Amino acid sequence: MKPPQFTWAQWFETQHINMTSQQCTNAMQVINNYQRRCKNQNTFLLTTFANVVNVCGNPNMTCPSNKTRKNCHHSGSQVPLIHCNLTTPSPQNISNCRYAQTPANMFYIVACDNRDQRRDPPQYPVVPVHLDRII
C-alpha cells in the first residue's frame, strides 16, 4: 500500500527506482517507514525514471500478475537490479529489520497509466505505476 502523499508514479519511483543506498537494509528503511511494516521483498531497478517511462511506450501486453490487465509493457532489454529479501523481521521498531541483497540483470514488466491529474508533473502524461514482474 502507499502513503497518501504519493501518486502511484511517485510511489513506484520510491519503491523501485530511487534506491537511497546500495545496501538493502538501508534502502528498505525508506519503504518500510512509509508503509509502516517491513516489506518481505522488493526489487530496485538500476535504471532511470525516464527509461521506465519510455518502456511504457513499448507495445501493451497482458500483465503476468493479472490476466485481466492489458496495461503492461516489457522492458525490451535487460537492466541491472537488486532484489531485497527480508532476513530479520523485527516486529515492532521496523527500523531494525535487516535484508539480504541479490544483484542481477533481468528484463522487467511494468504497468503504466495516465498520470495523476492533480499531483503528477505534466512532463510525463504516461507513467509507470506498478512493477509486475522481472525475468
Binding-site residues sit at 39-43
Check if the beta carbon of residue 132 is closer than 8 Å to that of residue 109: yes
Q: What's the CA gap between 133 and 135, in Å, rounded?
A: 7
* Active-site residue flag, 73: no
Q: What's the CA gap between 44 and 114, in Å, rounded?
A: 22
List binding-site positions for substrate: 39-43
Which of 3, 8, 96 is CA-nearest to residue 52?
8
* Active-site residue flag, 130: yes
Would you give the DSSP letter of residue 60?
E
Out of 73, 74, 83, 130, the active site residue is: 130
Element (H, E) at 44: strand 41-45
Out of 16, 73, 74, 83, the active site residue is: 16
Q: Which residues are designated catalytic? A: 16, 130
